Design a protein. Structure first.
Lengths: 108, 108, 54, 54
């Protein structure tokens, strides 16, 4: 069924966060760093669901709505991507901090 | 330098231990599911079952089958699918120098 | 096509009414028991999932 | 006629059960519940559909 297909698509990759809304419409989420251009889809199965991969709807954290099931399912991937980005930035800041400490010791 | 190497090797060995532990737990639950399915099939085998009882047993069996698929596709160590068939052969540096590694593989 | 008869459409004011009633109620019982078995399968699925998740 | 009166009373009881049993205002056994997905994973998807028919 649709839910099992979404779980399978989630399992077979880490760039997608598959999902299912209230009506049973496959929601495919692509984190910002993982997409650049026209996300194009093909295959007979996609025509079976009627999917259409194109520029996509741009959604950030500020555009999260939860009142609907699909809203929450998309929000899960949205927060996942946001967490990844924030953690990457914190890692960069930590690297800079370590470089600064080493430099300060060398300067002394 | 070798002390730092030993520390990182101990960390990597512990990480491998944790991955194996999580996989083992998932496997234990899966084998419990399989035992339940075996009991269902044996109960269905009995002669005095007519047809509706077999339909109910089959519904339970298909539910357990989809549960097995969900387990195989869902258990993950922080986003790293374990039993979905993607892990394959992976190394784990457990030595100070370069050229020490235990190969671990988790078939789907 | 046959005359559609459901549980709500059951009357026993006549012999034929009750003779059809026994079969209608048997079919309804089969349906309800099948749905109960499905729900029990879902309960077992959820319990196993809870143990795995824990 | 008396048996039919008891039967119709039980019919009305069945309808009342179908229309009344609820999980905190969410009717369960009147068909309106349709099918809902309980997300039991720890990431997008990983949910289980549930069937509950009138």
């Amino acid at each position: 069924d649709i839910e099992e297909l979404a779980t399978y698509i989630n399992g077979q990759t880490d760039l997608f966060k598959a999902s299912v809304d209230q009506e049973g419409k496959l929601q495919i989420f692509v984190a910002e760093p993982n997409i650049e251009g026209n996300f194009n889809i093909s295959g007979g199965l996609a025509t079976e669901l009627g999917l259409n991969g194109g520029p996509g709807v741009k959604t950030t954290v500020q555009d999260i709505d939860i009142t609907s099931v699909g809203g929450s399912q998309n929000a899960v991937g949205i927060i996942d991507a946001a967490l990844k980005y924030v953690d990457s930035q914190r890692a960069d800041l930590g690297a800079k901090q370590n470089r600064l400490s080493h430099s300060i010791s060398n300067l002394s | 330098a070798q002390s730092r190497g030993l520390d990182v090797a101990m960390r990597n060995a512990n990480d491998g231990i944790s991955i194996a532990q999580t996989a083992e737990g998932a496997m234990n639950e899966s084998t419990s599911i399989l035992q339940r399915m075996r009991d269902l099939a044996l109960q269905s085998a009995n002669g005095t079952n007519s047809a509706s009882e077999r339909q109910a047993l089959n519904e339970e069996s298909v539910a357990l089958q989809d549960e097995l698929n969900r387990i195989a596709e869902t258990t993950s160590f922080g986003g790293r699918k374990l039993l979905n068939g993607s892990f394959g052969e992976a190394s784990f540096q457990i030595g100070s120098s370069s050229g020490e590694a235990i190969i671990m593989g988790l078939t789907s």
